[PDB]
Amino acid sequence: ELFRSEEMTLAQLFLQSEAAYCCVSELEELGKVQFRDLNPDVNVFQRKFVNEVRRCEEMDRKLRFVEKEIRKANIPIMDTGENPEVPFPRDMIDLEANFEKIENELKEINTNQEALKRNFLELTELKFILFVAGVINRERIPTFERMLWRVCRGNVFLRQAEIENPLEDPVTGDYVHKSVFIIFFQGDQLKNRVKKICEGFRASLYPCPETPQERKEMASGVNTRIDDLQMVLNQTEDHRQRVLQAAAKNIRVWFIKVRKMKAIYHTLNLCNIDVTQKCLIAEVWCPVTDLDSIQFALRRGTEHSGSTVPSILNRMQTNQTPPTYNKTNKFTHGFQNIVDAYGIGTYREINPAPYTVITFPFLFAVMFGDFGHGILMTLFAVWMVLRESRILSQKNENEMFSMVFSGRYIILLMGLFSIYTGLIYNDCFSKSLNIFGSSWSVRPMFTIGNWTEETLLGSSVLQLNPAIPGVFGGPYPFGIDPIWNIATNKLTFLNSFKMKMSVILGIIHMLFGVSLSLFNHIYFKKPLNIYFGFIPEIIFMSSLFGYLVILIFYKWTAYDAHSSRNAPSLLIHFINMFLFSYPESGNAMLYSGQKGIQCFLIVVAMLCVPWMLLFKPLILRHQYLRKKFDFGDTMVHQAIHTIEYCLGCISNTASYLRLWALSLAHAQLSEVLWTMVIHIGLHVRSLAGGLGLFFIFAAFATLTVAILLIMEGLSAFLHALRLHWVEFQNKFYTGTGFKFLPFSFEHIRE
Amino acid sequence: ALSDADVQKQIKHMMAFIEQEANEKAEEIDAKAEEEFNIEKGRLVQTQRLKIMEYY
C-alpha cells in the first residue's frame, strides 16, 4: 500500500444562482473543492462580477487606508472572532458604505486638526510677542542685523527677545529655541526694504502691533481664543482616537469578511453563466472521498438560500488531466513542498514524500554527522516549535527566518539523526566519546610483543600498532573505536570506511528507487514496462552495482591482517570485472570461481540492454500491425531511456560520493577550527588560561556556527536533497501533474 | 453522495422548477394582459360614452 494522489472526478454542478451564492460561500469555507474556469476567453467585465469586485476593491483600499491610521494609533486589532463566520448578505454593501463614511469623517477631522494646529502655533507666536519680538532660531539674525546696516546705517534700534523653552516651529514641525531681533523703520522705502529682507530671511514677521491698552486687551482675547482652540482640538483628537480603536475592532473582522466576499465573487466569475435561466453550471475538481462532504455542505448552503434548489453535483467522465492532490498536515506539508519544488507528480504517481521524511534527514545526518552540532541543530528546531504560536501569529518580513521556520519540523529530524550518526562517527566537535569500552589494544601487551623502551626512539617517531599480535582485537560496541580519533592515520582508517559506506548506502538506496517503479507500472497495467523495463533494469543495476556491495562486506569479513600482503583491492577487481581482465598474476582473487562469476554477471548486464533497449517498441509494432503509432519516435525515445539509465547508473552511483566528500570536509573543518582556535584557550598559566579561554571560546563558538552550523549544514542540506531529487526520484518519480489549488478560505492571516 | 436514481430525481426536481417558473411567468403575463384589457377598455368606454352623452 503506497501513498498516491487523491482521486479526482472532474465533476460538474448545476444549481440556481441564488443558491449558488450561498453554496459558493459554504463550499469555500469547506475549502476542499477547486472550481475551474468555464469561460477562459471572458474578461472581468464579461464575467459580470466586476461590480461586486470593484466594490470590494474600493472597500479594501479604503479599509487599508484607515488601517494605516489604526496601526499608527497602536490599536490591538486582535482579530479573534466573528470574522470566521463570513456572512455575505447583500446588505453588506451598505455596511461597506458605512465604513467609507467613518474613515472619511476621520480624514476630515485630522485635516481640521492640522489647520487648528497651525492656528494654535500662529496664535502662540503672537502670544509670545505680546519691529517685532518674533520667533527666530537666530539662524540669520547675526546677519539680519548686518543686512539692515547694509540697507541703511541702523537708523532704528532693533527689539531683542529670547524665548525660554521655545514653541515647536510649525514649518520645522519640532521645538527649537527662538530668539528675536527685529528692526522697525519710519521711512517707507526702507520699511519696504526691510519687509523684503524679512520675507527672504528666516524670521517671523506678521505682528500687528498697537501701543494702546487695547492691544494688550486684544492679546488677552488671543490667549482666550487660543485656549478655546486647544480645547476643541483636544476634544477632536479624543473623539478621533476613540473612533479609531472602536473601528479597529470591527476592521479586523471586516478585513477578512471583505476578502472572503471578493474571493467568492472572483470564483463565481471563473464560471459559465447560463443565458436562459438564472442558474449556474460549473465544473469543479474535488476529492472523491470528500464528495459526500461536499454534498452535505451544498445541502446546508442551499438550505440557507430561500429557493432550496437541489444543487446536484454530478460526476463527468473525467478525461482531462486532473490535479495532483496530496493530503498534508502540520508535519508532512514541509516535506511535500521540497518534493514539489522539483515538480508536481503525475496523477496517481507514487508519492516520494512519506519516504523523504526519513530518507532525506538521514542522508543529511550522514553528511552532517557531528554530535555537537546535532545538539545545536536540534535545539534550534525545538526553540522554533516551542515559539510556534508566537512566531506564526506575527509578521515575519525576513524570508530567511520564515523559510527555516516553515522547515522547522524538517530541521528537527535532521538534528535528531545528526546526533545518531555523530555518535556512530564518534565525533562531537572533533572529540570522541569513550564509554570505557575502548578495548582496541592492550598497551601493556604491546610492550610484551617485542617493544621494549620504544618511547626512547619514540621521541622522534610514531610506530604503528600491529594487527593480529594475538593480544589486540574486538569491535567497538557502537560507532568507531575512540582510539582512532587521536591517531595520525585517522585520515586513512576512517576515510576508507566512509568511501565504502557511501557506495553501500548509495547503491542500496538506488535499488529501492527502482523497486518503487514496479508498483507504479503495476498500477497502470503496463506489462511491457515490467517485462521489458523493470526486470532488465533492476537486474542490470544489481548485476553490476549490487555485486560490488556484496564484495565490500565480503572483504571486511573474509580477510584479516594475516593476509594483508597481497590483500585484494576491490576497486581494481571492479574495473577488471567490467573489462573481462583476468591477469595470470599480480592480483589475488577474493574467492575461488570469482572469475566465472564476474564474467557471467557482466554478460547478463549486457544481455539486459536489448530488453530495455528495443524489445518494447518491437512488440508494440507487432501488436500495432496485428491490430491493423509513431514507430520511429518510439524507438528513439526508448533508446534514450536506456542510454540515460545505463550511463546514469554509473554516474549516480559515483554521485553518492557526495556523502563521503562532505562528511570528510565537515570533520576537517571542525578539526582545524578546534585546533587553531580553542586549543589556544588552554595554557599552563592558571588565571591567564581561565580568562583567555572565555574570550577564545566565544570566538570558537562564533566560528563554529558561522562555518559549520550554517554554511556546511546548508551544503549538507542541499547535497542530501540533490541526491533525493536526482538519483532517487529519477528511478520511479516521473512525469508531471498540476498543483491542486482548491477554492478555500486559507488567507486568514493575510 | 447521490446515486443515479437520486441524480435523475434531482434533475426532475430542477425541471419541475423550470415548469413552475414557466407557469408563474405566464400567469403573471396573462394577469397583466387582463389588467391592460380592463384599463384600455375603461379608457375607451368612458371617452366615447361621454361623447354620446354630450350629443344627447
Whole-number Å distance between alpha carbons of A497 and A506: 14
Whole-number Å distance between alpha carbons of A515 and A621: 28
Secondary structure letter of residue A5 according to DSSP: P
Q: Which of A300, A322, A294, A321 is nearest to A32 (CA)?
A: A294
Whole-number Å distance between alpha carbons of A283 and A313: 9
- Strand partners for A33: A743
Cβ(A350)–Cβ(A728) below 8 Å: no
Whole-number Å distance between alpha carbons of A6 and A320: 15
- Strand partners for A174: A169
Indicate the helix (H) or strand (E) that contains A326: none
Interface residues of B toward A, Cβ cutoff 8 Å, are 1-2, 6-7, 10-11, 13-14, 17-18, 21
Which of B15, B17, B18 would you mutate first to test chain A, the one with the most A CBs within 10 A? B17
- Strand partners for A179: A137, A162
CA–centroid distance for A333 within its chain: 12
- All three cell numbers of A170, joined, read 510649525
Q: Is A363 exposed, middle or buried (0-12, 13-18, 19+ CB in 10 A)?
A: buried
- All three cell numbers of A281, joined, read 453550471
- All three cell numbers of A61, joined, read 483600499
Q: How many beta carbons lie within 10 A of that of residue A41, not counting itself? A: 6
Method: cryo-EM
Q: What are the helix (H) ranges across A270-395? A: 291-304, 332-340, 353-367, 371-386, 388-392
CA–centroid distance for A11 within its chain: 34
| C-beta atoms of A296 and B14 within 8 A | no
Resolution in Å equals 3.9
Place of cell 577487481: A573
Nearest Cα residue in chain B from A309: B14
| C-beta atoms of A314 and B17 within 8 A | no
Whole-number Å distance between alpha carbons of A55 and A49: 10
| C-beta atoms of A292 and B18 within 8 A | no
Phi, psi of A91 (to 5 degrees): -70, -10
Cβ(A37)–Cβ(A308) below 8 Å: no
| C-beta atoms of B2 and A312 within 8 A | yes
- Strand partners for A281: A14, A272
| C-beta atoms of B1 and A295 within 8 A | yes
Question: Is residue A317 less than 8 Å (CB to CB) from chain B?
Answer: no
Q: What are the helix (H) ranges across A656-685? A: 657-675
- Strand partners for A312: A14
Place of cell 508519492: A351
CB within 8 Å of A369: residues ≥ 6 apart: A418, A421, A422, A424, A425, A427, A663, A666
* Burial per residue of A119-134, b for 16 or more beta-carbon CB atoms within 10 angstroms, e otherwise: bbbbbbbbbbbbbbbb
Three-state secondary structure of A137-185: ECCCHHHHHHHHHHHCCCCCCEEEEECCCCCEECCCCEECCCEEEEECC
CA–centroid distance for A165 within its chain: 53
